[model samples]
Target: MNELYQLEKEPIVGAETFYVDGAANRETKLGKAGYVTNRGRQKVVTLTDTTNQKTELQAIYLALQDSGLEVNIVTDSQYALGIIQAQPDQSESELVNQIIEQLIKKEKVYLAWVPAHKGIGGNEQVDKLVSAGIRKVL
Candidate 1:
């Protein structure tokens, strides 16, 4: 009897990871996108005429542009991830297309999804930043 040997792949952590999020205020129609990393790096952007999903994608776009060549981008929007995995279409939204373009430019990109507001540190930080941006409307 001959036995075949196999090796299981071990998880390798090689990229800098960042948690990204987006928030929108319906009444004010304000959209916010931001990202926070464990290294105390954070960014927030406020804009008008954006939706929750679109803002989420925007967060990813900014993170990809700012992060290193090899990076892990974590987001709470599953829809955005699904769109990223799908093939590009002429009718696709410009924001999503921008994200894909940024993704292609990277040497390596690890896209991840986590449950929103689930007590994650980076996630919480980005949320606070977004809220802070929205609160400045006064």
Candidate 2:
């Protein structure tokens, strides 16, 4: 669990303009500055505030299971690097972006996606083991 959700990921920071028509107010630009860090790994931090979060977890779980570590991530610069500094909120997602920024700095650290459920050699063996175990439980 610590492996996945320890940190949320890159947070997008910028400003957005909203149109408040009926209020007779001009374009309302509040503090539309909260960034998204993107998850709750281990059961990480994610954007969606929805529950029944288990099945959603299953997909990512299977993904990691299918492909071992070395998760790939993204950046607006196509590629970027910097230190992860705490934002105003100092939440997990905020802190997380800074983490990614810092990580990108190291030439060694990189982000990439791992395809899941394609085909892995030992995976079949593990499935067989689970099959017998599954029969008993079900």
Global lDDT of each candidate: 0.56, 0.22
lDDT of 2 by residue, 25-115 (tens): 0122111111111232222222232111111222222223212223333221111122112221234433334433333332211222123
Instruction: Compute each candidate's TM-score over C-alphas.
Output: 0.66, 0.19
Q: Give stretches of model 1 more than 4 Å off.
A: 1-13, 26-29, 87-91, 114-116, 119-121, 124-126, 129-138
**On residues 43-97, what C-alpha lDDT tens digit does candidate 1 reach at each position?**
8877465555556667777776776565666665566656644522222656767
- At residue 113, give the lDDT of candidate 2: 18
- Model 2, residue 37: distance off in Å is 22
Q: After superposition, how far is residue 73 of candidate 1 from its true place, in Å?
A: 0.6
- In terms of lDDT, the best-performing candidate is 1
